[PDB]
Structure formats: structure tokens, C-alpha cells
Amino acid sequence: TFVALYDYESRTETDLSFKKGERLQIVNNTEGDWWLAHSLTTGQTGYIPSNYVAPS
């Protein structure tokens, strides 16, 4: 259960854009600074910038 501190604007279809306060279910966070998050609001996959999210 992570939270995107800032709004992220996905630049490709392989990532999901979130907003400040949007909850994102982290998935894979062992590759680099970007992890695969799953939006629970609609239910879609989309990488995410770890520098914009934080562990709550």
C-alpha cells in the first residue's frame, strides 16, 4: 500500500499516471527506481516513479 506524494504523468502506455494522495498497490520494486504499481480505483497496471511515491 504505497501513496504517490506527487502526481505522476505517465509518458507511455506501460505506466499509470497518479495524483497526490492516490493509493497505488506496489508490485515489483527490485528493478531500479521505477516499480510496477496497480491502481485499485479502476484496476489497471502501470509502472510508477518511486521518487514520487513513499511507503506508508
Binding site: 506527487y6 509518458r11 527506481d33 521518487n51
Partner: peptide
């Protein structure tokens, strides 16, 4: 907020 970082690794 910081500048968008490099996606994990550079393509290959």
C-alpha cells in the same frame, strides 16, 4: 517533487 528518474535501467 524531484525530476522524473530513469526507468530502472536504460532499455538494455
Amino acid at each position: 517533487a524531484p525530476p522524473l528518474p530513469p526507468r530502472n535501467r536504460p532499455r538494455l
